[PDB]
C-alpha cells in the first residue's frame, strides 16, 4: 500500500521553528528523489525543495537559508526543518515522491502550517434550529454555527458520521475580530424532526476542543 | 608529421551520451595550437609563474553531450544530476572545460532521443568514474529481477533535444582536457 | 525567471464538451512538461508527463501535447468526475527546481436550479454572550450567482453581513450559499422583523423568508 503521511504542521509564531515529517510506505525514501510542495490558502502550487536519490539537496529562493530537507533511512521518513518562519510561509505542505521527467506520482495528504502572532482559541457552537414553519411532508433545514475560533481548521460531522447526505459545511469566513466563523447545515425530512436526533460533532484540533451539540426545534 | 589528434576529438561526427562519456589519450605527438568560437572555455589549477619549461603530461580529452545549462556542472566542486551521476570532476581538477552549442547537429524536430543521461543512482560518482550499467533501478523494497515496472526503472533518461527548446536546454558538445603541468626541459 | 501562464484561468463547460487548457512558457523550455489535477481539499494527482504520456490509470480521454513554448492538455469528452483545478509543471535545469502554472479552474455546467431558502434566528445561548448571528441559507442551486438582501424591519442592511459558498456538488453540480448577519444583542432587540430576500436566475421573482424576534 503506497502512501505518504505528513505531520508536524501547526500554529507557530513568526520567527519560530517547525519540523515537518513525511512517513513513506511502499517505496524507499533513501532511493528516490523527494520534493516538498506548498500551497498558500486559496493560491497555487509552489515548489519548496527536493533531495536527490544520492543526497544532493536544493531549495526555492524564497526559503533559502531557512529550510532544510533531510531523510532518515531507518524510519523511511522525509523531513523539512523550517526556521525563521514568516507569515507568507503559511500554507499546506505536501511531500511527494519525485520521478523528475516522469512527474510527481505519489502525494501525501498535506499538513497545515499557520504562521501568526495570534493565539489559539476554541470555538463556540450554536444551534441553527429548524423552523416551526417547516412543511409537513416537505424538507426542513438545520445546522450548527461554529463561531469565534483560531486558527483553521474545524471539522464537522453529523450523528457521528451516520448522516452525510444533504450536509453542507461552508468555507469559514474571517471576521473583523481576527477569528473564524463557519456554519454546517443539513436538509432532512420535515416529518423526521420530532423523532430522529440531530447532533453535530465539531472538532478543532489546534486547541483539542471537541463539541457535540444536539440541534432540535426551539421550545414554544 | 604526428600532430596531436585534437581534430579527431573536437570535430568528431558523433559524440557520446554523457553517461558513457568518451576518453581519448593525447600522447606521443606535437600539439598544434589553434585558437572565441566556443561558448565555454574555462581552466582550473593552471597556476604557473615560469612559462619557459612547461610540459603537459597525462593529457586526456573527454567528450560528451549535455544541456547548455548543465555545462556549469562540469567544474570542480559542483553538484547536480550530471556531476553526481554522469561526469564528476575532482576538487583539485587541473585542466580546461570547453563547450559549444550543437543544436543544428544534435537536435531533431521530432525530438532526438538518442542522447541520454543517468537519472537514477543511489550514490554519487567518484571523480572520473564512468558508470555504464543499464540495470533496472530498485526504488523500493521488492526486487526487480530485470523487469521494469512500479519502483523498477530503467536508470537512463532521454534529453529529447528539439530545435525549439530554450537555448539552456539545447544540446552542447563538451570537451574536458585534463593534464598535469610539470616543469622540465625538452 | 521562467513563468508558465495558463489560459483560461477559469472555465465552465458541459458534460460531453471538449476542453483544451493551454500553458504558455514565458521563454524556451525543455521538451518535458507535466499536468496535475487538484480536486478541492485534496492533493494534486498526476495526469500527464513528458508533455503527452498518460500517467498509468488515467482515462484515455485525457491527452497532452505541445512544442516550443505553447503546450496543451485536452479532455476529449468532459465527464462529470473531471471538475478540478489543473496545473502545468516544468522541471527547470538551472537552478534545479520546478515552476508551476497559476492553475485553471474547471467547473461543470448544468441546468438552472433555484435555491431553497431558509432563515435562522440567533440562539438563546449565543444571545447571552451579547452578539446575535442571523443566518440565511441558499441550498442547492445553479448557477453560482445569487443576491442575498437582508432586511430588518424592512430597512435594507449593508455592511454587517458575510457570506461563503460551497464548492460544486459531486452528486448534482449545484452550489450552496450561507450568509450571516451580525448584530449586537442591544441592536438585535431593537427590531422585530428579520428577513432574507433572495434573487436568483431560477426564481421568477425574489423569495423572502423571515421570522419575528421572539415568536414561535
Ligand atoms: C575542425 O575543423 C575546422 C574546419 O576547417 C578546422 O578549422 C579546425 O582546426 C578543426 N579542429 C581542430 C582541433 O583541428
Numbering used by the authors:
A (entry chain H): 1 to 220
B (entry chain E): 333 to 367, 372 to 522
C (entry chain L): 1 to 216
Provide text from the study:
Its side chain –OH also forms a conserved hydrogen bond with the main chain oxygen atom of RBD L455. To explore the potential emergence of SARS-CoV-2 resistant strains to public antibodies, we selected escape mutants by growing a replication-competent recombinant VSV-SARS-CoV-2 in the presence of P22A-1D1 or P5A-3C8. To assess the public antibody’s protection efficacy in vivo, we tested P5A-3C8 in a golden Syrian hamster model of SARS-CoV-2 infection. Compared to the VRC01 control group, the total viral loads in the P5A-3C8 group were significantly reduced in lung, demonstrated by both viral RNA (genomic RNA and subgenomic RNA) and infectious virus titer measured by PFU. The P5A-3C8 group experienced a slight weight loss during the first 2 days after virus challenge and began to recover to gain body weight afterwards while those in the control group continued to drop without recovery.
Neutralizing antibodies (nAbs) that effectively block RBD-ACE2 interaction represent potential prophylactic and therapeutic options and could also guide vaccine design. Here we interrogate a total of 165 antibodies from eight COVID-19 patients, and find that potent nAbs from different patients have disproportionally high representation of IGHV3-53/3-66 usage, and therefore termed as public antibodies. Crystal structural comparison of these antibodies reveals they share similar angle of approach to RBD, overlap in buried surface and binding residues on RBD, and have substantial spatial clash with receptor angiotensin-converting enzyme-2 (ACE2) in binding to RBD.
